[PDB]
Amino acid sequence: MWDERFSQSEYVYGTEPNDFLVSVANQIPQGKILCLAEGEGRNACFLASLGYEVTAVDQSSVGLAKAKQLAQEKGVKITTVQSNLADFDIVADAWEGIVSIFCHLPSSLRQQLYPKVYQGLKPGGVFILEGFAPEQLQYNTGGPKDLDLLPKLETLQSELPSLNWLIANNLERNLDEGAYHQGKAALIQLLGQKLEHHHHHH
Fold it and tell me: Which molecular function GO terms apply here (predicted)?
Protein backbone atom coordinates (compact mmCIF):
# COMPACT_ATOMS: atom_id res chain seq x y z
CA MET A 1 0.00 0.00 0.00
CA TRP A 2 1.66 3.22 -1.36
CA ASP A 3 0.50 6.02 0.99
CA GLU A 4 -2.75 7.46 2.44
CA ARG A 5 -3.02 11.26 2.84
CA PHE A 6 -4.15 12.71 6.22
CA SER A 7 -7.13 14.85 5.04
CA GLN A 8 -6.52 17.82 7.44
CA SER A 9 -7.70 20.32 4.79
CA GLU A 10 -11.39 21.01 5.61
CA TYR A 11 -13.51 23.37 3.47
CA VAL A 12 -16.87 24.45 4.94
CA TYR A 13 -18.85 25.75 1.96
CA GLY A 14 -19.39 29.55 1.96
CA THR A 15 -23.16 29.57 1.27
CA GLU A 16 -25.89 31.82 2.80
CA PRO A 17 -27.98 29.71 5.36
CA ASN A 18 -31.37 28.95 3.68
CA ASP A 19 -34.65 27.51 5.07
CA PHE A 20 -36.14 25.13 2.41
CA LEU A 21 -33.39 24.88 -0.28
CA VAL A 22 -30.76 23.20 2.03
CA SER A 23 -32.97 20.06 2.60
CA VAL A 24 -33.27 19.40 -1.16
CA ALA A 25 -29.49 20.18 -1.52
CA ASN A 26 -28.86 17.53 1.22
CA GLN A 27 -30.79 15.12 -1.10
CA ILE A 28 -28.89 16.16 -4.30
CA PRO A 29 -25.55 14.21 -5.02
CA GLN A 30 -22.41 16.48 -4.62
CA GLY A 31 -21.53 16.02 -8.36
CA LYS A 32 -22.73 17.32 -11.76
CA ILE A 33 -26.24 18.80 -11.17
CA LEU A 34 -28.54 19.69 -14.08
CA CYS A 35 -30.82 22.72 -13.49
CA LEU A 36 -33.79 23.34 -15.83
CA ALA A 37 -35.01 26.72 -17.25
CA GLU A 38 -36.43 28.99 -14.48
CA GLY A 39 -36.93 32.80 -14.08
CA GLU A 40 -34.76 32.53 -10.93
CA GLY A 41 -31.68 30.37 -11.66
CA ARG A 42 -30.23 32.01 -8.48
CA ASN A 43 -30.84 28.58 -6.82
CA ALA A 44 -28.30 27.07 -9.30
CA CYS A 45 -25.42 29.30 -8.03
CA PHE A 46 -26.49 28.46 -4.41
CA LEU A 47 -26.00 24.75 -5.20
CA ALA A 48 -22.60 25.63 -6.82
CA SER A 49 -21.40 27.42 -3.58
CA LEU A 50 -22.10 24.08 -1.86
CA GLY A 51 -18.95 22.82 -3.75
CA TYR A 52 -21.16 21.08 -6.35
CA GLU A 53 -20.50 21.30 -10.15
CA VAL A 54 -23.82 22.83 -11.32
CA THR A 55 -24.84 22.86 -15.01
CA ALA A 56 -27.87 25.18 -15.63
CA VAL A 57 -30.25 25.16 -18.64
CA ASP A 58 -32.40 28.05 -19.77
CA GLN A 59 -34.19 28.49 -23.14
CA SER A 60 -33.27 32.23 -22.71
CA SER A 61 -29.73 33.75 -22.40
CA VAL A 62 -31.07 36.25 -19.77
CA GLY A 63 -31.42 33.40 -17.19
CA LEU A 64 -28.06 31.79 -18.11
CA ALA A 65 -25.99 35.05 -17.99
CA LYS A 66 -27.59 35.99 -14.60
CA ALA A 67 -26.81 32.50 -13.13
CA LYS A 68 -23.24 32.74 -14.55
CA GLN A 69 -22.88 36.34 -13.17
CA LEU A 70 -23.76 35.22 -9.60
CA ALA A 71 -21.36 32.27 -10.13
CA GLN A 72 -18.22 34.43 -10.67
CA GLU A 73 -19.40 36.87 -7.92
CA LYS A 74 -19.78 33.90 -5.48
CA GLY A 75 -16.41 32.33 -6.56
CA VAL A 76 -18.11 29.26 -8.09
CA LYS A 77 -18.62 27.62 -11.52
CA ILE A 78 -21.79 26.96 -13.61
CA THR A 79 -21.91 25.06 -16.95
CA THR A 80 -24.15 27.16 -19.25
CA VAL A 81 -26.59 25.04 -21.36
CA GLN A 82 -28.99 26.70 -23.84
CA SER A 83 -31.49 23.91 -24.50
CA ASN A 84 -35.21 23.23 -24.72
CA LEU A 85 -37.52 21.08 -22.54
CA ALA A 86 -39.15 19.52 -25.71
CA ASP A 87 -35.77 18.22 -27.19
CA PHE A 88 -32.91 18.31 -24.59
CA ASP A 89 -33.89 18.85 -20.95
CA ILE A 90 -32.82 16.11 -18.47
CA VAL A 91 -30.56 13.17 -19.50
CA ALA A 92 -29.41 11.27 -16.34
CA ASP A 93 -27.26 9.10 -18.71
CA ALA A 94 -25.08 12.13 -19.76
CA TRP A 95 -25.38 13.90 -16.34
CA GLU A 96 -24.91 12.61 -12.74
CA GLY A 97 -27.53 14.54 -10.71
CA ILE A 98 -30.56 16.77 -11.53
CA VAL A 99 -32.47 19.69 -9.93
CA SER A 100 -35.73 20.89 -11.57
CA ILE A 101 -36.99 24.11 -9.89
CA PHE A 102 -40.86 24.41 -10.30
CA CYS A 103 -41.68 23.82 -13.99
CA HIS A 104 -43.49 26.85 -15.53
CA LEU A 105 -44.59 25.45 -18.94
CA PRO A 106 -47.82 25.77 -21.11
CA SER A 107 -49.66 22.47 -21.99
CA SER A 108 -47.43 22.12 -25.12
CA LEU A 109 -44.02 21.93 -23.31
CA ARG A 110 -45.66 20.65 -20.07
CA GLN A 111 -47.03 17.40 -21.64
CA GLN A 112 -43.55 17.11 -23.29
CA LEU A 113 -41.72 17.49 -19.92
CA TYR A 114 -43.57 15.00 -17.56
CA PRO A 115 -42.64 11.89 -19.82
CA LYS A 116 -39.03 13.32 -19.78
CA VAL A 117 -38.96 13.30 -15.93
CA TYR A 118 -40.51 9.80 -15.91
CA GLN A 119 -38.29 8.17 -18.60
CA GLY A 120 -35.39 10.68 -18.89
CA LEU A 121 -34.80 11.35 -15.16
CA LYS A 122 -33.20 8.17 -13.76
CA PRO A 123 -32.92 8.12 -9.85
CA GLY A 124 -30.52 10.79 -8.43
CA GLY A 125 -32.25 14.01 -9.43
CA VAL A 126 -34.73 16.05 -7.34
CA PHE A 127 -37.96 17.62 -8.70
CA ILE A 128 -38.82 20.76 -6.69
CA LEU A 129 -42.44 21.84 -7.32
CA GLU A 130 -44.28 24.66 -5.55
CA GLY A 131 -47.80 24.72 -6.98
CA PHE A 132 -50.67 27.09 -6.24
CA ALA A 133 -54.43 26.70 -5.46
CA PRO A 134 -57.20 27.63 -8.09
CA GLU A 135 -58.07 30.42 -5.55
CA GLN A 136 -54.47 31.91 -5.89
CA LEU A 137 -54.55 33.87 -9.24
CA GLN A 138 -58.14 34.87 -8.20
CA TYR A 139 -56.58 36.86 -5.24
CA ASN A 140 -55.44 39.25 -8.08
CA THR A 141 -51.97 39.29 -6.43
CA GLY A 142 -50.44 37.95 -9.66
CA GLY A 143 -50.45 35.28 -12.33
CA PRO A 144 -48.37 33.93 -15.32
CA LYS A 145 -51.48 33.96 -17.64
CA ASP A 146 -54.15 31.60 -16.27
CA LEU A 147 -54.70 28.99 -13.47
CA ASP A 148 -53.90 26.43 -16.20
CA LEU A 149 -50.16 27.17 -15.52
CA LEU A 150 -50.65 26.11 -11.83
CA PRO A 151 -48.89 22.69 -11.38
CA LYS A 152 -51.12 20.85 -8.80
CA LEU A 153 -50.47 17.58 -6.77
CA GLU A 154 -53.26 15.85 -8.79
CA THR A 155 -51.26 16.21 -12.03
CA LEU A 156 -47.63 16.13 -10.80
CA GLN A 157 -47.70 13.09 -8.46
CA SER A 158 -49.97 11.16 -10.98
CA GLU A 159 -47.37 11.59 -13.79
CA LEU A 160 -44.47 10.38 -11.56
CA PRO A 161 -45.30 7.06 -9.61
CA SER A 162 -41.58 6.21 -10.21
CA LEU A 163 -40.35 9.43 -8.57
CA ASN A 164 -41.93 8.90 -5.10
CA TRP A 165 -42.03 12.26 -3.29
CA LEU A 166 -40.44 12.95 0.14
CA ILE A 167 -42.82 15.98 0.40
CA ALA A 168 -46.46 15.95 -0.90
CA ASN A 169 -48.58 18.39 1.20
CA ASN A 170 -50.46 21.75 1.13
CA LEU A 171 -48.32 24.49 2.82
CA GLU A 172 -49.83 27.94 3.69
CA ARG A 173 -47.83 31.19 3.20
CA ASN A 174 -49.03 34.70 4.22
CA LEU A 175 -49.06 37.39 1.46
CA ASP A 176 -47.65 40.90 2.23
CA GLU A 177 -50.64 42.76 3.86
CA GLY A 178 -52.38 43.60 7.16
CA ALA A 179 -55.71 45.09 5.97
CA TYR A 180 -57.93 42.18 4.77
CA HIS A 181 -56.55 39.88 7.59
CA GLN A 182 -57.08 37.02 5.04
CA GLY A 183 -54.37 37.92 2.48
CA LYS A 184 -52.84 34.44 2.72
CA ALA A 185 -51.88 31.88 0.02
CA ALA A 186 -52.89 28.25 -0.37
CA LEU A 187 -49.75 26.56 -1.78
CA ILE A 188 -48.55 22.97 -2.25
CA GLN A 189 -44.94 21.65 -2.23
CA LEU A 190 -43.35 18.50 -3.72
CA LEU A 191 -39.81 17.15 -3.29
CA GLY A 192 -39.01 14.21 -5.56
CA GLN A 193 -35.83 12.25 -4.71
CA LYS A 194 -33.92 9.08 -5.73
CA LEU A 195 -35.63 6.18 -3.93
CA GLU A 196 -33.07 4.47 -1.63
CA HIS A 197 -36.18 2.39 -0.81
CA HIS A 198 -37.35 0.26 -3.80
CA HIS A 199 -41.12 -0.13 -4.46
CA HIS A 200 -42.08 -2.60 -1.69
CA HIS A 201 -43.83 -5.75 -3.10
CA HIS A 202 -43.40 -9.51 -3.87
Answer: methyltransferase activity
**Stretch (H or E) spanning 111:** helix 107-115
Helix (H) or strand (E) holding 43: helix 42-48
- Distance spanning both ends of the chain, measured CA to CA: 45
Structural domains of the chain in order of their starting residue, each with its CATH number: 1-202 (3.40.50.150)
CA proximity to 113, closest of 87, 94, 92, 131: 87
Q: Please, which experimental method was used?
A: NMR
The answer to whether 62 and 91 have CB atoms below 8 angstroms apart is no
Q: Where are the alpha helices (DSSP H) in 116-175?
A: 153-158
Pairwise CA distance, residues 78 & 86, whole Å:
22
Residue 151: count of CB within 10 angstroms of its CB = 20
Question: Do the Cβ atoms of 132 and 104 come closer than 8 Å?
Answer: no
Question: What span, in angstroms and rounded, lies between the C-alpha atoms of 153 and 30?
Answer: 28
| Dist. CA 120–CA 163, nearest whole Å | 12
